[PDB]
């Protein structure tokens, strides 16, 4: 390993709605992340959410797609 997370967030076709409900502030701001895919998870373990963080730094997200591998196969490369 390396990031010690064993899930690393990824791009994976624009969110439906990301936030879940009304966790973050960060429902729609201005310039959202668009640049920070490459991301750990480290959610759920801990309790039963999800978080994100990247170059952007770090937000609420869901097991949706983007920022969340999961699928293990959810990129068209640069």
């Given at each position: ?11 994976a076709?624009?969110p439906?709605?990301?936030?879940s409900?009304?966790?973050l ?13 490459q ?19 770090s937000?609420?997200?869901d ?5 969340k ?5 959810s990129?068209?490369?640069?």
């Open positions: 390993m390396d990031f010690a997370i064993g899930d690393r967030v990824r791009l076709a624009q439906p709605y990301l936030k409900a009304d966790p502030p960060m429902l729609r701001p201005p310039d959202l992340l668009a640049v920070g895919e991301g750990t998870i480290t959610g759920l373990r801990p309790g039963g959410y999800w978080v994100v963080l990247f170059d952007r730094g937000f609420l997200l097991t949706q797609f983007l920022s591998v999961e699928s293990g196969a990129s068209s490369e640069g």
